[PDB]
Each structure stands twice: as C-alpha cells, then as structure tokens.
C-alpha cells in the first residue's frame, strides 16, 4: 500500500530564531 | 583525563546536569565535577611569587 496523504507546500517563514543548541559542555 | 595541580575547595557554583568542567574568560580550568560524588569543586593555583 502507498498512503501518500501528504503534500509539499514549499512554504517558509522569516521569524524563527530557534536553531540554537549547546555545542559543548564548558 | 584532565591533569593539573592546585588546591581543591568547595564553591557555590550550580552546574547543569550535563556539565563536567568550567572555564573562565581567559580559558583556564577553574572548576570540575566528581565522577563518583557529583560535587562542585573549584581549582585555585598554588602560591608563588
């Protein structure tokens, strides 16, 4: 079976300052 | 693996559950953690002059 009930909207935003993590343990 | 020399005393630092050692602005180790006790200990250089 192939239940492909998803579509690609190719939409984005310009208000996400979220991609920040801890690079090390100092 | 962290080797050195100095005096070990008790400090009031509150580390995070995923932190091991601490560094200052000039990037020198001044605090470590006990692998068997989990206690906050500070490192101070021995006397010289």
Other CB atoms within 10 Å distance of the CB of residue A19:
5
Cα separation, B40 vs B22, whole angstroms:
10
Asked if the Cβ–Cβ distance from B22 to A26 is below 8 Å, we say yes
Cα separation, B18 vs B35, whole angstroms:
12
| Cα nearest neighbour of A26 on chain B | B22
Query: In Å, how far are A15, A21, A22, B27 from A18, measured between CA atoms?
Result: 9, 9, 12, 27
Asked if the Cβ–Cβ distance from A26 to B18 is below 8 Å, we say no
Asked if the Cβ–Cβ distance from A26 to B23 is below 8 Å, we say yes
């Amino acid at each position: 079976q192939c239940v492909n009930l998803i579509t690609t909207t190719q939409s984005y935003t310009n208000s996400f300052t979220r991609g920040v993590y801890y690079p090390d343990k100092v | 693996g962290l080797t050195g020399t100095g005096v070990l005393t008790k400090s009031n630092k509150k580390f995070l559950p995923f932190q091991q050692f601490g560094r200052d602005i000039v990037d020198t180790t001044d605090a470590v953690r006990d692998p068997q006790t989990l206690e906050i200990l500070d490192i101070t250089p021995c006397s010289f002059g």
